[PDB]
DNA sequence: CATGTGATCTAATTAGATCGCATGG
DNA sequence: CATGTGATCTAATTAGATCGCATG
């Protein structure tokens, strides 16, 4: 009979910290959030809407083993690398092996360093992320060096937006039904502000470029506003992805720095929902 | 670990070689007999685990680079991701007290941009070995500790630069300097003759 | 006795609805708040962060005496007027007669057309605000316009922000003493995000342009952040003239459009410091 | 019958001239520069039944915009307005003489609460008015376009400075309000 | 037979430097 | 004499359109 205790978490990619965003949500206690990223903006977000909590610690490959075992242990290891390399929305993407699509081996690679040695059974879960939309050679590697398959979980089914995405991991249940949460705004209307109104009852994927706002290829506006055509704010961004709204509203960000982003990131609801069961392994309220 | 074997206690070596076949360099050292112990895998994207594990135990893991040619149907960095992930696959269980060796030739054909990659994932900075009578050369990523105590002629990565990008433009392996770095295994493993 | 009854205001130039604003802060019911403006994007805030409460009226040129009478009686007139052809920060200022600058003649004329004629003792109240920073001439003409001379209040006694402003009206005891609430934010410190550091108490009078932003003629950047010198986040700015957090964070609004209307706009706290008396004249929740 | 003699203050320009060829302590108060003048100062130089203003013609003797004179009008106008109280009938004058822009001109009419009524003099140039008065927006006159007086007004630029012969056939159906001196 | 954790074009905005001097402190 | 509810000019950065095609 022993009381769980907080959770120790390494976080690579880690975008604008969503991962603990979703922890202190879910009310798990953080002893440790340890983030590898790279992009000022991003680690602006993460300084300021976490006070402080995240330590920041540079590019994912000035990491090593070394590293691993003085910050050390870790309970959770999560993160989504690039895929602008990977996803099939580029005609350009070098691939797995080139470009940033080699990242993914930095977290194959980390992920081994900070795995418990065989013989060790303390509770150790991890996910990564990434994009449905890659080539299929693409995906088989990944799973390989994973040694794992995906679950693919559609934001669509939680929130406002289609969002096909790839799950690989360990976390209890990652393969169970998606529950729709009365904190789940599903309908593009219900993330808008006030005085607008939702052409679409859910919108396509939002990528970081302002054409994905726009619906189809014939670039439908998303919302009226007394009977002119507008696309998303910010803020009716956010509340898509289920960010706090004004989560991005920090340094100074353009439009389009606050959607490169939020294009990069998780849906929150689905990480939620991935993150849940882990309330019942480690310290909690 | 780097301690020796009396002689009467050293087994036949077994070892996993990948994109080689590395027969004709150990058994003409004297590591494997001439009979019907060396695991050639043809094309390792969908080796898993438990396909090493079967493959029997192994003391030493072997990869390399091809060569400057045509065979590059892989991205230079294809090779060194596989090997490493193969190798954890070949680990023996922390508990295991045999000797356990690896290494990874590069044949100069990986630039700057791989070759960091080549030395975090490794955990080691090349040993660059030379052929004199300027001929050849290549790099050499193990934990073997004789080819880190061992003190080859230096070349400055400028000299093996110019030779590299000039040996890349020319356009089989150097026999003789992979030969070279399994002769301080010898120490480990049973030794067979002619 | 004859109960008090929600109070009904005329706000011309109302901007981002200051007015509306500072009059539910101090918990004044309100009847009705008419705004005259013209820009959209201080339309669009004023909509949205009032739930489509204010009605806009357009052009203050458009509002006729036959409006003042079918969409009246107002118990309350204010009004800041344009000031672009008015302060002496621009040298290309064509006066209070010319550009914008005869804009201040349109409150005189509507703030005349909604005066209780003599013998109607109905309580009545006007405010009219402006810069200091204004011609001689200029400002004797104002004051003989609306037969009162203003009181200079200087928004630096309650917030972290030098604005020295004019005052025209009638309201109660607009010569009292300032007093600092214990919720003003005083120190620019006070204001700044998290992890950030001011290197001044007060700043200068911050404008519509970002050198305003900069301290004295050497420029100077107002706060450090790890080290790195930086402006003020638009946060900040809203935290400076004491508006919510997230106040302009509206319409995809770049952080210069951010800047423009709160540039033009009313320190919060001197407003309500203006309209506090207010309280004793009209219905309260 | 009752009909006691006019009190006329005129802002910009002494009208006596014109005003004393129809012999309308003098019953009239002209004003030196109106910007000091304040409520009190129109208040204590007794009631008044009818206040003139007016622009200068296209020239010099003007150091204002063409718009301060009539903010300026506009403003003592109803410092001199009565209590409604007070039966005795009260009118207001102001005309401008083409300096007055379209721009300006729309501030002209908001202000006064009505487009002004244009009249010419073909043998010179024309003006135009605004007026409560109920003899020159009633009676027709001679209606021409804005236009045609642009054309009259680059021929007043062209040619150049007064308006008094027109000027005069307009306070004129004021003397069945006051006294007459024929 | 639509679709996309992007990218490359443009023409439109924005950020920073600079200019400005009457004024009341 | 430091200051300013601005404005102009100029590289910088954003919108916005368009381009892609492997894959589920
Ligand atoms: N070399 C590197 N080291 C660490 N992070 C890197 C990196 N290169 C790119 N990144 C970061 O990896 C992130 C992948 S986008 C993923 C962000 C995260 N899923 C979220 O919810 O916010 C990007 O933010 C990018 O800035
Ligand atoms: N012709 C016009 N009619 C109505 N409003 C106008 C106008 N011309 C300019 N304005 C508006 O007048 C405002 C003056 S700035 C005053 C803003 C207000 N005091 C606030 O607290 O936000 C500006 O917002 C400008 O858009």
Not at chain 1, 29 to 36: G, L, P, W
Not at chain 1, 214 to 225: A, E, L
Not at chain 1, 227 to 233: A, H
Not at chain 2, 102 to 107: A, I, K, Q, R
């Amino acid at each position: 009979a022993e009381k769980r205790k907080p959770i120790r978490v390494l976080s690579l990619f880690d975008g604008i910290a969503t991962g603990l965003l979703v922890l202190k949500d879910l009310g798990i206690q953080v002893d440790r959030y340890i983030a590898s990223e790279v992009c000022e903006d991003s680690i602006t977000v993460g300084m300021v809407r976490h006070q402080g909590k995240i330590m920041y610690v540079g590019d994912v490959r000035s990491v090593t083993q070394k590293h691993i075992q003085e910050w050390g242990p870790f309970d959770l290891v999560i993160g989504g690398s690039p895929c602008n390399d990977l996803s099939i929305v580029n005609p350009a993407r070098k691939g797995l092996y080139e470009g940033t699509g080699r990242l993914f081996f930095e977290f194959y690679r980390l992920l081994h360093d900070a795995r418990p040695k065989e013989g060790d059974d303390r509770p150790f879960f991890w996910l990564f992320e990434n994009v449905v939309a890659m080539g299929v050679s693409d995906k088989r590697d990944i799973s390989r060096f994973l040694e794992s398959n995906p679950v693919m979980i559609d934001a669509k089914e939680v929130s406002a937006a289609h969002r096909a995405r790839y799950f690989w991991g360990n976390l209890p249940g990652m393969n169970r039904p998606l529950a729709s949460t009365v904190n789940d705004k599903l309908e593009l209307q219900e993330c808008l502000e006030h005085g607008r109104i939702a052409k679409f009852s859910k919108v396509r994927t939002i990528t970081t470029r302002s054409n994905s706002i726009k619906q189809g290829k014939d670039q439908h506006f998303p919302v009226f506003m007394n009977e002119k055509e507008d696309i998303l704010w910010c803020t009716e961004m956010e509340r898509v992805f289920g960010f706090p709204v004004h989560y991005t509203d920090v340094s100074n960000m353009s439009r389009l720095a606050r959607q490169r982003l939020l294009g990069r990131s998780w849906s929150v609801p689905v990480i939620r929902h991935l993150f849940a069961p882990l309330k019942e392994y480690f310290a909690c309220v | 670990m780097f301690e020796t074997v009396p002689v009467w206690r050293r087994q036949p070596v077994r070892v996993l070689s990948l994109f080689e076949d590395i027969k004709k360099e150990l058994t003409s050292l004297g590591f494997l007999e001439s009979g019907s112990q060396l695991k050639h895998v043809v094309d390792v994207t969908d080796t898993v685990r438990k396909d090493v594990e079967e493959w029997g135990p192994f003391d030493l893991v072997y990869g390399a680079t091809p060569p400057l040619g045509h065979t590059c149907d892989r991205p230079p960095s294809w090779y060194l991701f596989q090997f490493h992930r193969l190798l954890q696959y070949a680990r023996p269980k922390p508990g295991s007290p045999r000797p356990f060796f690896w290494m990874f030739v590069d044949n100069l054909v990986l630039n700057k941009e791989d070759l960091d990659v080549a030395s975090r994932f490794l955990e080691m900075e090349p040993v660059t070995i030379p052929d004199v009578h300027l001929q050849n050369a290549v790099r050499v990523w193990s934990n073997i500790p004789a080819i880190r105590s061992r003190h080859w002629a230096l070349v400055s990565e400028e000299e093996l630069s110019l030779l590299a990008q000039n040996k890349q433009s020319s356009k089989k392996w150097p026999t003789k300097l992979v030969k070279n770095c399994f002769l301080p295994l010898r120490e480990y493993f049973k030794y067979f003759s002619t």
